[PDB]
């Protein structure tokens, strides 16, 4: 005698006004590698978008152009190890998000959905992320 | 029309694949065509991506409209600045090569 | 010769005014108990604390009553082997991100209402011959239902999906979505297009970001994550 | 008073949401009746969801069949204690009932022709028991009850049935021999509810939890049959408890009889297929009462299996692995979880286990509850029953496999059809008294604050071990009498009950205490009727009365025989009454209905020797 939408409205009606607690979730659930790689894909994605936006704002507000700031950094004569670490930190989120994005596109085709295949594809993404980042940073 | 949800999902995957194809194109054929293509792909892919984050974590009629309105402003200024950099400066493909030559 | 195993169980009493949730520790001798976690819960209730409240029935993993979070993961207490390592204490919580009725008993009314919204029954255009003759279905068309019809509606998968935590009011969840897919590919159903058009909104289906907590935690070995992806493929290819 | 009482008014009320309860529920709503379905569990949690084997129907999908052959199998299977008019109705409606389930969306297994797959089962044959093994058990692999219940629950969502999930029915509202409705407790908020209706349907399942080792769920506590006992009405044939042959060792989980229907066999310590010696024709597919007694003798003589020699093996590894994964995928996972056995290499340890209750609330073939006064049956107005909680009786002294799921939907629909042809929707709801059901609340409040010497779990275990050791497969007079004096002592010891949870919201301590009162009332009538019945019929085997006592000696030509008086033979239903205050059991008897619904269409089967 109650439709599904009426039952949903009654659910939130009597639960939000009651004294019932909300059972814990994020602070108690056991983590896994595919789960930890899901939030990392979102974290790198947002970090890359905020980096493009900051670079876009710098082009509109900085008094100098891009070739000037390159010479400023090149004149400081930084150590090759520090230059390698800076290049690695910039290419790592792009590399991880790119490979795991390909991993998402394969999923969108309906392939590799077995739990053991999900673990294999995730490990493949991790090693390709390290190899691609280390090679590009070594240039 | 009546399939607005599925068409938006398909357009997201198409832009992701397009943006994926621009990465080797920027290294093999750097130039203005790839510079402005990256400007359009990075803005659209990032705008739709941050919209999914807002849809998941922002709730309430007023907070949703405020977050989505600010995302349009953020994406509009982002695409405008990238197009400014490609026309008045060295462009995206050249800026990366200059940064890696440090 | 006792092998004491420690269990820390979520507790809350609604009849106690001002009662706050807490974790109570119990000691159970595994030599005088069954091999499953539900056997330990029943032993605690019968001997140590009759106030401990939880759902149970079939004790064989077919009814789906005893769904709870054991050792950090959602599973069935009647099929979850007790960890014999006496050095660590097993933590038992209710299904995550659910309004707690009492102790380990969550409120599944919204989960049930979502399963009703997809109309989980056979629908035909010419239903005037209901109950006359058996419908025909090949063995191959019947094999397509394997891995889908075995769902026991325990909600272990949906209560493990983070998207269902934040948007449970409008996101159907992997359990309901896979059953919606179970009726989409049933060769006897004639409303495949109408069931797809129901999910033409930003929340009902497209809150799934392929986190795959659902398939990992399913006690029936099913793959609700894969079924959601097959729905998405159908959503982008069907014509009106 | 202290408990807020909420009154409801409906045309009909259905207590139970299993296979039988759901079919009766939306069947009444389909007929236009404002119907309420009261259930202490969510519908898909009911024990029907655990059914594996299948559901019988003479569809003729594997070979040429006839429902009258299925009629003969059930009558012979019941050992001529079942009512042949109810058996006629069930077996004739069987094809239309299964077709209705498939048309609902039930994912039956399929053949090369696209029709419902059917397997063999125990005690079924062709040509009135002369044409070989029959194959009429329609199944969904080995998850038939799981899919049957989920299909019925999905179908019920299309009608305006007012559901009341997780409500515990306490007693019936009786007035002047008529049922006015039910009274129940809402487990969520702890409020008392009175459901007023012109008709009431009881589909609360069996009471397998009266024993220590059973295949039934923890919620199969016979709550509806206890309400009938507290209303002063009798129960029928409660001493006939079916022991399923193959229950897994230890946890008691059921291994489906379909294993033996696909090619599975039983072996003892010497690897002998011993069923070829007990049943040379039926082999491992004999009736359950015969197979269970055969397994018990092999164990107690000294040919058991395992380290304790207390069970036997169920061999399945000789069958192709593809058939094991397609036909029996459910038990393959269960045998690995609850035994660590791979069915493709090693056999499953099994033993007879309490499974099904043949007895229940006596009804006619229409579902109407009946009483027996002065040698005649009287339909109790406004009270119906269907499913395992009822006694049609289609099963008699021994139920055939896959006949219960048929019972559920056939007689669940019969209740809705009988009410639709008797009453009209919207008729005036029968008024009650301003204090109706006050003794139900007084009992609940007494148990809620009980602070005695014996806790509820301590008293339940004493009942289960008493039934397990005194009313087992083989019974005798001295042991049955010793169990009667124990249960009566245990029932008196219920005044020393002690509960700890003083809350009212989801007080499972209080709920399981109410179920103990229900289990004890069922246990008393079961063992007292078993001690009184001095014969051997079906699942009731008396080692001191090893013969079947009918009105005639049917092992010889009846020409020139003297008919035994009704008080001197035992071919009759046992009717039990209990004074709930003291616990004394009173027993009476009624004759078995031998007529069918149409002699020209279906001939009545006279009693004869029963062999497999
Ligand atoms: C135990 C079992 C039985 C079984 C089987 C396998 C197992 C493990 N396999 C079968 C098979 O393959 N073929 C077959 O024909 N039968 C098989 N069976 C037997 C059969 O499944 C049962 O006899 C049958 O399913 C019983 O169904 P019914 O609808 O009669 O009852 P239920 O499904 O057990 O559910 C009872 C309902 O009653 C409600 N209830 C109980 N007490 C109360 C109170 N106090 N208040 C309100 N409601 C109550 C329950 O909620 C439940 O829904
Ligand atoms: C993240 C920051 C950018 C990461 C760039 C990774 C690649 C860096 C690199 O090594 O590019 C080298 C490439 C060729 O330059 P070179 O090595 O001199 O060789 C010349 C002869 N082929 O240089 C090129 O020709 C251009 C090819 C790369 C173009 C990349 C364009 C997309 C970049 C998107 C970045 C988004 C995130 C930005 C985050 C930081 C924001 C401040
Ligand atoms: C430069 C890039 C930027 C600024 C960017 C930005 C983003 C953002 C903000 C998201 C949202 C994350 C989420 O919703 O969890 C996202 C998601 C995604 N990205 Fe990118 N991305 C970049 C490169 C790429 C590349 C090269 C590929 C290939 C790719 C594939 C994807 C896919 C498939 C998703 C969907 C994630 C999901 O559905 O859960 N991205 N991106
Ligand atoms: C920059 C990006 C970095 C991404 C990774 C960050 C670090 C994440 C660390 C989280 C690892 O979390 C760990 O994952 C593994 C593999 O899924 C889990 O193991 C899981 O699968 C294995 C293998 O089938 C099982 O043996 C085990 O019972 C199960 O829990 C483990 O229980 C979890 O504790
Ligand atoms: O919403 C989350 C993450 C999340 O809740 C968890 F971190 F898992 F809790 C995500 C959405 C898409 C990828 S992760
Ligand atoms: O009770 C029945 O009808 C048969 C049964 O449980 C089985 O063995 O599958
Ligand atoms: S899918 Fe697996 S987990 Fe989610 S409900 Fe159905 S069975 Fe329980
Ligand atoms: S757990 Fe969650 S978001 Fe997608 S695939 Fe599984 S549902
Ligand atoms: S009790 Fe039925 S699933 Fe655990
Ligand atoms: K019965
Ligand atoms: Mg005393």
GROMACS .gro file of N, CA, C and O in nm, chain C residues 14-15 36 42 45-47 50-53 55-57 59-60 62-65 78 101-102 105 112 116 120-122 127 129-131 133-137 139 142 145 149-153 182-183 188, chain D residues 42 45 49-50 61 99-100 102-108 110-111 114-116 140 143 146-147 150 154 158 166 209 214-219 251 337-338 455 457 460 500-501 503-506 508-509 512:
model
  392
  255UNK      N    1   1.871   0.129   2.202
  255UNK     CA    2   1.780   0.243   2.182
  255UNK      C    3   1.688   0.269   2.300
  255UNK      O    4   1.641   0.382   2.316
  256UNK      N    5   1.662   0.168   2.383
  256UNK     CA    6   1.574   0.185   2.498
  256UNK      C    7   1.644   0.251   2.616
  256UNK      O    8   1.577   0.286   2.714
  277UNK      N    9   3.227  -2.114   1.277
  277UNK     CA   10   3.185  -1.991   1.211
  277UNK      C   11   3.162  -1.880   1.312
  277UNK      O   12   3.141  -1.903   1.431
  283UNK      N   13   2.604  -1.669   1.849
  283UNK     CA   14   2.497  -1.743   1.914
  283UNK      C   15   2.543  -1.797   2.048
  283UNK      O   16   2.466  -1.801   2.145
  286UNK      N   17   2.537  -1.503   2.292
  286UNK     CA   18   2.401  -1.466   2.331
  286UNK      C   19   2.341  -1.569   2.427
  286UNK      O   20   2.269  -1.532   2.520
  287UNK      N   21   2.370  -1.697   2.406
  287UNK     CA   22   2.312  -1.802   2.488
  287UNK      C   23   2.379  -1.817   2.623
  287UNK      O   24   2.317  -1.870   2.716
  288UNK      N   25   2.503  -1.771   2.638
  288UNK     CA   26   2.577  -1.798   2.761
  288UNK      C   27   2.633  -1.674   2.828
  288UNK      O   28   2.635  -1.667   2.951
  291UNK      N   29   2.271  -1.219   2.687
  291UNK     CA   30   2.147  -1.236   2.613
  291UNK      C   31   2.096  -1.106   2.552
  291UNK      O   32   2.001  -1.110   2.473
  292UNK      N   33   2.156  -0.992   2.586
  292UNK     CA   34   2.115  -0.864   2.529
  292UNK      C   35   2.177  -0.837   2.393
  292UNK      O   36   2.136  -0.741   2.326
  293UNK      N   37   2.273  -0.918   2.349
  293UNK     CA   38   2.333  -0.900   2.218
  293UNK      C   39   2.232  -0.933   2.109
  293UNK      O   40   2.173  -1.042   2.109
  294UNK      N   41   2.211  -0.839   2.017
  294UNK     CA   42   2.105  -0.848   1.918
  294UNK      C   43   2.164  -0.851   1.778
  294UNK      O   44   2.251  -0.770   1.744
  296UNK      N   45   2.059  -1.027   1.350
  296UNK     CA   46   1.973  -1.105   1.263
  296UNK      C   47   2.041  -1.235   1.222
  296UNK      O   48   2.161  -1.236   1.192
  297UNK      N   49   1.964  -1.343   1.221
  297UNK     CA   50   2.013  -1.473   1.176
  297UNK      C   51   1.893  -1.563   1.151
  297UNK      O   52   1.785  -1.542   1.206
  298UNK      N   53   1.913  -1.664   1.066
  298UNK     CA   54   1.805  -1.756   1.033
  298UNK      C   55   1.858  -1.887   0.976
  298UNK      O   56   1.856  -1.990   1.045
  300UNK      N   57   2.156  -1.994   0.891
  300UNK     CA   58   2.292  -2.032   0.929
  300UNK      C   59   2.366  -2.112   0.822
  300UNK      O   60   2.457  -2.189   0.854
  301UNK      N   61   2.331  -2.093   0.695
  301UNK     CA   62   2.401  -2.161   0.587
  301UNK      C   63   2.430  -2.070   0.468
  301UNK      O   64   2.469  -2.120   0.362
  303UNK      N   65   2.228  -1.858   0.277
  303UNK     CA   66   2.134  -1.859   0.166
  303UNK      C   67   2.025  -1.754   0.189
  303UNK      O   68   1.968  -1.701   0.093
  304UNK      N   69   1.997  -1.722   0.315
  304UNK     CA   70   1.893  -1.625   0.344
  304UNK      C   71   1.945  -1.482   0.346
  304UNK      O   72   1.871  -1.389   0.310
  305UNK      N   73   2.070  -1.461   0.385
  305UNK     CA   74   2.128  -1.328   0.385
  305UNK      C   75   2.094  -1.243   0.505
  305UNK      O   76   2.105  -1.120   0.498
  306UNK      N   77   2.054  -1.304   0.617
  306UNK     CA   78   2.010  -1.227   0.732
  306UNK      C   79   2.128  -1.171   0.812
  306UNK      O   80   2.122  -1.057   0.859
  319UNK      N   81   2.749  -1.658   0.921
  319UNK     CA   82   2.733  -1.803   0.922
  319UNK      C   83   2.829  -1.874   0.827
  319UNK      O   84   2.840  -1.997   0.835
  342UNK      N   85   1.943   0.026   1.413
  342UNK     CA   86   1.823   0.005   1.493
  342UNK      C   87   1.862  -0.037   1.634
  342UNK      O   88   1.814   0.020   1.733
  343UNK      N   89   1.950  -0.137   1.646
  343UNK     CA   90   2.002  -0.183   1.774
  343UNK      C   91   2.120  -0.276   1.752
  343UNK      O   92   2.112  -0.368   1.671
  346UNK      N   93   2.197  -0.456   1.416
  346UNK     CA   94   2.077  -0.464   1.333
  346UNK      C   95   2.061  -0.329   1.262
  346UNK      O   96   2.021  -0.230   1.326
  353UNK      N   97   1.551  -0.192   0.054
  353UNK     CA   98   1.439  -0.268   0.000
  353UNK      C   99   1.355  -0.183  -0.095
  353UNK      O  100   1.308  -0.233  -0.198
  357UNK      N  101   1.253  -0.238  -0.506
  357UNK     CA  102   1.117  -0.233  -0.559
  357UNK      C  103   1.104  -0.135  -0.675
  357UNK      O  104   1.020  -0.155  -0.763
  361UNK      N  105   1.130  -0.564  -1.001
  361UNK     CA  106   1.203  -0.690  -1.022
  361UNK      C  107   1.110  -0.809  -1.047
  361UNK      O  108   1.104  -0.905  -0.970
  362UNK      N  109   1.036  -0.802  -1.158
  362UNK     CA  110   0.947  -0.910  -1.196
  362UNK      C  111   0.933  -0.912  -1.347
  362UNK      O  112   0.961  -0.814  -1.416
  363UNK      N  113   0.889  -1.027  -1.399
  363UNK     CA  114   0.875  -1.044  -1.543
  363UNK      C  115   0.759  -0.961  -1.596
  363UNK      O  116   0.649  -0.963  -1.540
  368UNK      N  117   0.030  -0.972  -2.171
  368UNK     CA  118   0.015  -1.049  -2.049
  368UNK      C  119  -0.124  -1.109  -2.034
  368UNK      O  120  -0.160  -1.154  -1.924
  370UNK      N  121  -0.218  -1.384  -2.155
  370UNK     CA  122  -0.201  -1.529  -2.147
  370UNK      C  123  -0.116  -1.569  -2.027
  370UNK      O  124  -0.035  -1.661  -2.033
  371UNK      N  125  -0.134  -1.498  -1.915
  371UNK     CA  126  -0.060  -1.529  -1.793
  371UNK      C  127  -0.114  -1.657  -1.730
  371UNK      O  128  -0.230  -1.663  -1.689
  372UNK      N  129  -0.030  -1.760  -1.724
  372UNK     CA  130  -0.069  -1.886  -1.664
  372UNK      C  131  -0.128  -1.988  -1.758
  372UNK      O  132  -0.193  -2.082  -1.711
  374UNK      N  133   0.055  -2.133  -2.075
  374UNK     CA  134   0.160  -2.226  -2.115
  374UNK      C  135   0.295  -2.172  -2.070
  374UNK      O  136   0.312  -2.053  -2.045
  375UNK      N  137   0.392  -2.263  -2.060
  375UNK     CA  138   0.526  -2.225  -2.020
  375UNK      C  139   0.596  -2.149  -2.132
  375UNK      O  140   0.590  -2.189  -2.249
  376UNK      N  141   0.661  -2.039  -2.097
  376UNK     CA  142   0.740  -1.965  -2.194
  376UNK      C  143   0.863  -2.046  -2.234
  376UNK      O  144   0.916  -2.125  -2.157
  377UNK      N  145   0.907  -2.025  -2.358
  377UNK     CA  146   1.025  -2.093  -2.410
  377UNK      C  147   1.150  -2.011  -2.382
  377UNK      O  148   1.149  -1.888  -2.392
  378UNK      N  149   1.258  -2.080  -2.345
  378UNK     CA  150   1.387  -2.017  -2.324
  378UNK      C  151   1.495  -2.121  -2.346
  378UNK      O  152   1.496  -2.224  -2.278
  380UNK      N  153   1.868  -2.310  -2.359
  380UNK     CA  154   1.970  -2.331  -2.257
  380UNK      C  155   2.071  -2.217  -2.259
  380UNK      O  156   2.118  -2.172  -2.153
  383UNK      N  157   1.924  -1.924  -2.098
  383UNK     CA  158   1.917  -1.947  -1.955
  383UNK      C  159   2.054  -1.932  -1.890
  383UNK      O  160   2.063  -1.887  -1.775
  386UNK      N  161   2.158  -1.595  -1.736
  386UNK     CA  162   2.114  -1.559  -1.602
  386UNK      C  163   2.208  -1.611  -1.493
  386UNK      O  164   2.196  -1.568  -1.378
  390UNK      N  165   2.107  -1.438  -1.084
  390UNK     CA  166   1.989  -1.476  -1.008
  390UNK      C  167   2.023  -1.530  -0.869
  390UNK      O  168   1.931  -1.549  -0.789
  391UNK      N  169   2.150  -1.557  -0.840
  391UNK     CA  170   2.189  -1.613  -0.712
  391UNK      C  171   2.200  -1.510  -0.601
  391UNK      O  172   2.234  -1.546  -0.488
  392UNK      N  173   2.173  -1.382  -0.630
  392UNK     CA  174   2.185  -1.278  -0.529
  392UNK      C  175   2.085  -1.302  -0.416
  392UNK      O  176   1.966  -1.323  -0.440
  393UNK      N  177   2.135  -1.300  -0.292
  393UNK     CA  178   2.053  -1.323  -0.174
  393UNK      C  179   2.008  -1.194  -0.107
  393UNK      O  180   1.947  -1.199   0.000
  394UNK      N  181   2.039  -1.079  -0.167
  394UNK     CA  182   1.995  -0.948  -0.115
  394UNK      C  183   2.041  -0.926   0.029
  394UNK      O  184   1.966  -0.877   0.113
  423UNK      N  185   1.966  -0.825  -1.432
  423UNK     CA  186   1.914  -0.961  -1.442
  423UNK      C  187   1.784  -0.966  -1.520
  423UNK      O  188   1.757  -1.064  -1.591
  424UNK      N  189   1.701  -0.862  -1.509
  424UNK     CA  190   1.577  -0.855  -1.585
  424UNK      C  191   1.595  -0.792  -1.723
  424UNK      O  192   1.508  -0.808  -1.809
  429UNK      N  193   1.282  -1.350  -2.172
  429UNK     CA  194   1.137  -1.352  -2.159
  429UNK      C  195   1.077  -1.215  -2.128
  429UNK      O  196   0.956  -1.198  -2.140
  523UNK      N  197   1.188  -1.065   0.710
  523UNK     CA  198   1.173  -1.017   0.573
  523UNK      C  199   1.139  -1.135   0.483
  523UNK      O  200   1.198  -1.243   0.498
  526UNK      N  201   1.383  -1.402   0.362
  526UNK     CA  202   1.461  -1.474   0.461
  526UNK      C  203   1.395  -1.604   0.506
  526UNK      O  204   1.459  -1.684   0.575
  530UNK      N  205   1.344  -2.010   0.109
  530UNK     CA  206   1.461  -1.968   0.032
  530UNK      C  207   1.572  -2.072   0.035
  530UNK      O  208   1.660  -2.071  -0.052
  531UNK      N  209   1.569  -2.164   0.132
  531UNK     CA  210   1.672  -2.266   0.144
  531UNK      C  211   1.637  -2.394   0.070
  531UNK      O  212   1.718  -2.488   0.071
  542UNK      N  213   0.781  -3.297  -1.972
  542UNK     CA  214   0.889  -3.237  -2.050
  542UNK      C  215   1.003  -3.333  -2.080
  542UNK      O  216   1.073  -3.315  -2.180
  580UNK      N  217   0.356  -2.375  -1.414
  580UNK     CA  218   0.349  -2.284  -1.528
  580UNK      C  219   0.328  -2.141  -1.482
  580UNK      O  220   0.385  -2.047  -1.538
  581UNK      N  221   0.247  -2.122  -1.377
  581UNK     CA  222   0.227  -1.989  -1.322
  581UNK      C  223   0.357  -1.933  -1.265
  581UNK      O  224   0.384  -1.813  -1.277
  583UNK      N  225   0.673  -2.016  -1.364
  583UNK     CA  226   0.762  -1.983  -1.475
  583UNK      C  227   0.717  -1.855  -1.545
  583UNK      O  228   0.800  -1.772  -1.583
  584UNK      N  229   0.585  -1.838  -1.562
  584UNK     CA  230   0.533  -1.716  -1.622
  584UNK      C  231   0.556  -1.594  -1.534
  584UNK      O  232   0.555  -1.482  -1.584
  585UNK      N  233   0.576  -1.614  -1.403
  585UNK     CA  234   0.612  -1.504  -1.316
  585UNK      C  235   0.756  -1.458  -1.338
  585UNK      O  236   0.788  -1.343  -1.306
  586UNK      N  237   0.842  -1.544  -1.391
  586UNK     CA  238   0.979  -1.507  -1.417
  586UNK      C  239   1.080  -1.598  -1.350
  586UNK      O  240   1.200  -1.567  -1.347
  587UNK      N  241   1.034  -1.710  -1.296
  587UNK     CA  242   1.122  -1.802  -1.226
  587UNK      C  243   1.221  -1.866  -1.323
  587UNK      O  244   1.178  -1.925  -1.424
  588UNK      N  245   1.351  -1.856  -1.299
  588UNK     CA  246   1.453  -1.903  -1.396
  588UNK      C  247   1.477  -2.053  -1.390
  588UNK      O  248   1.586  -2.101  -1.355
  589UNK      N  249   1.375  -2.130  -1.426
  589UNK     CA  250   1.387  -2.275  -1.429
  589UNK      C  251   1.499  -2.318  -1.523
  589UNK      O  252   1.528  -2.252  -1.623
  591UNK      N  253   1.653  -2.549  -1.818
  591UNK     CA  254   1.592  -2.567  -1.949
  591UNK      C  255   1.644  -2.692  -2.017
  591UNK      O  256   1.753  -2.742  -1.986
  592UNK      N  257   1.564  -2.744  -2.110
  592UNK     CA  258   1.600  -2.858  -2.192
  592UNK      C  259   1.641  -2.812  -2.331
  592UNK      O  260   1.646  -2.692  -2.361
  595UNK      N  261   1.366  -2.602  -2.489
  595UNK     CA  262   1.329  -2.477  -2.427
  595UNK      C  263   1.230  -2.487  -2.314
  595UNK      O  264   1.184  -2.383  -2.265
  596UNK      N  265   1.194  -2.608  -2.272
  596UNK     CA  266   1.096  -2.628  -2.167
  596UNK      C  267   1.166  -2.646  -2.032
  596UNK      O  268   1.289  -2.647  -2.022
  597UNK      N  269   1.086  -2.661  -1.927
  597UNK     CA  270   1.139  -2.672  -1.792
  597UNK      C  271   1.208  -2.807  -1.774
  597UNK      O  272   1.150  -2.912  -1.803
  621UNK      N  273   1.539  -2.531  -1.036
  621UNK     CA  274   1.634  -2.428  -1.078
  621UNK      C  275   1.771  -2.471  -1.026
  621UNK      O  276   1.812  -2.430  -0.917
  624UNK      N  277   1.877  -2.459  -0.646
  624UNK     CA  278   1.838  -2.340  -0.572
  624UNK      C  279   1.691  -2.308  -0.598
  624UNK      O  280   1.652  -2.191  -0.608
  627UNK      N  281   1.512  -2.089  -0.341
  627UNK     CA  282   1.566  -1.953  -0.348
  627UNK      C  283   1.499  -1.873  -0.459
  627UNK      O  284   1.454  -1.760  -0.438
  628UNK      N  285   1.492  -1.931  -0.579
  628UNK     CA  286   1.431  -1.859  -0.691
  628UNK      C  287   1.280  -1.854  -0.680
  628UNK      O  288   1.218  -1.756  -0.722
  631UNK      N  289   1.204  -1.565  -0.424
  631UNK     CA  290   1.236  -1.434  -0.478
  631UNK      C  291   1.145  -1.397  -0.594
  631UNK      O  292   1.113  -1.279  -0.612
  635UNK      N  293   0.892  -1.074  -0.574
  635UNK     CA  294   0.887  -0.974  -0.678
  635UNK      C  295   0.747  -0.954  -0.733
  635UNK      O  296   0.705  -0.842  -0.760
  639UNK      N  297   0.347  -0.592  -0.712
  639UNK     CA  298   0.256  -0.534  -0.810
  639UNK      C  299   0.117  -0.509  -0.755
  639UNK      O  300   0.032  -0.454  -0.828
  647UNK      N  301   0.870  -0.792   0.998
  647UNK     CA  302   0.928  -0.804   1.132
  647UNK      C  303   0.824  -0.772   1.240
  647UNK      O  304   0.849  -0.694   1.332
  690UNK      N  305   1.299  -2.689   1.487
  690UNK     CA  306   1.391  -2.654   1.595
  690UNK      C  307   1.356  -2.719   1.728
  690UNK      O  308   1.422  -2.689   1.829
  695UNK      N  309   1.886  -3.035   1.311
  695UNK     CA  310   1.781  -3.019   1.211
  695UNK      C  311   1.835  -2.941   1.092
  695UNK      O  312   1.934  -2.868   1.103
  696UNK      N  313   1.767  -2.956   0.978
  696UNK     CA  314   1.799  -2.878   0.860
  696UNK      C  315   1.729  -2.743   0.858
  696UNK      O  316   1.766  -2.657   0.778
  697UNK      N  317   1.631  -2.723   0.945
  697UNK     CA  318   1.550  -2.602   0.942
  697UNK      C  319   1.628  -2.483   0.996
  697UNK      O  320   1.731  -2.496   1.064
  698UNK      N  321   1.578  -2.364   0.964
  698UNK     CA  322   1.640  -2.240   1.010
  698UNK      C  323   1.610  -2.218   1.158
  698UNK      O  324   1.524  -2.284   1.218
  699UNK      N  325   1.682  -2.122   1.217
  699UNK     CA  326   1.659  -2.088   1.357
  699UNK      C  327   1.521  -2.028   1.381
  699UNK      O  328   1.475  -2.025   1.495
  700UNK      N  329   1.455  -1.980   1.276
  700UNK     CA  330   1.325  -1.915   1.288
  700UNK      C  331   1.209  -2.010   1.263
  700UNK      O  332   1.093  -1.967   1.267
  732UNK      N  333   2.711  -2.958   1.098
  732UNK     CA  334   2.625  -2.840   1.093
  732UNK      C  335   2.480  -2.874   1.061
  732UNK      O  336   2.392  -2.792   1.087
  818UNK      N  337   3.222  -2.564   0.218
  818UNK     CA  338   3.224  -2.469   0.328
  818UNK      C  339   3.206  -2.540   0.462
  818UNK      O  340   3.278  -2.513   0.558
  819UNK      N  341   3.111  -2.633   0.469
  819UNK     CA  342   3.073  -2.697   0.594
  819UNK      C  343   3.129  -2.838   0.609
  819UNK      O  344   3.083  -2.913   0.695
  936UNK      N  345   1.772  -2.004   3.239
  936UNK     CA  346   1.767  -1.910   3.128
  936UNK      C  347   1.707  -1.977   3.005
  936UNK      O  348   1.704  -2.100   2.993
  938UNK      N  349   1.796  -2.010   2.692
  938UNK     CA  350   1.881  -2.101   2.615
  938UNK      C  351   1.904  -2.233   2.689
  938UNK      O  352   1.920  -2.337   2.625
  941UNK      N  353   1.589  -2.442   2.625
  941UNK     CA  354   1.574  -2.486   2.487
  941UNK      C  355   1.663  -2.606   2.457
  941UNK      O  356   1.621  -2.699   2.387
  981UNK      N  357   1.737  -1.146   3.038
  981UNK     CA  358   1.828  -1.039   3.077
  981UNK      C  359   1.798  -0.906   3.011
  981UNK      O  360   1.815  -0.801   3.073
  982UNK      N  361   1.753  -0.907   2.885
  982UNK     CA  362   1.721  -0.784   2.815
  982UNK      C  363   1.585  -0.734   2.861
  982UNK      O  364   1.483  -0.800   2.840
  984UNK      N  365   1.471  -0.432   2.759
  984UNK     CA  366   1.420  -0.346   2.655
  984UNK      C  367   1.305  -0.411   2.579
  984UNK      O  368   1.269  -0.526   2.601
  985UNK      N  369   1.247  -0.333   2.488
  985UNK     CA  370   1.133  -0.379   2.411
  985UNK      C  371   1.166  -0.371   2.262
  985UNK      O  372   1.111  -0.446   2.181
  986UNK      N  373   1.257  -0.281   2.226
  986UNK     CA  374   1.297  -0.265   2.086
  986UNK      C  375   1.398  -0.374   2.052
  986UNK      O  376   1.507  -0.380   2.109
  987UNK      N  377   1.362  -0.460   1.957
  987UNK     CA  378   1.447  -0.570   1.909
  987UNK      C  379   1.504  -0.651   2.025
  987UNK      O  380   1.624  -0.679   2.032
  989UNK      N  381   1.553  -0.961   2.114
  989UNK     CA  382   1.559  -1.098   2.064
  989UNK      C  383   1.562  -1.199   2.179
  989UNK      O  384   1.520  -1.314   2.161
  990UNK      N  385   1.611  -1.157   2.296
  990UNK     CA  386   1.600  -1.241   2.415
  990UNK      C  387   1.453  -1.268   2.447
  990UNK      O  388   1.416  -1.381   2.481
  993UNK      N  389   1.296  -1.487   2.133
  993UNK     CA  390   1.333  -1.628   2.139
  993UNK      C  391   1.275  -1.698   2.260
  993UNK      O  392   1.264  -1.821   2.260
   0.00000   0.00000   0.00000
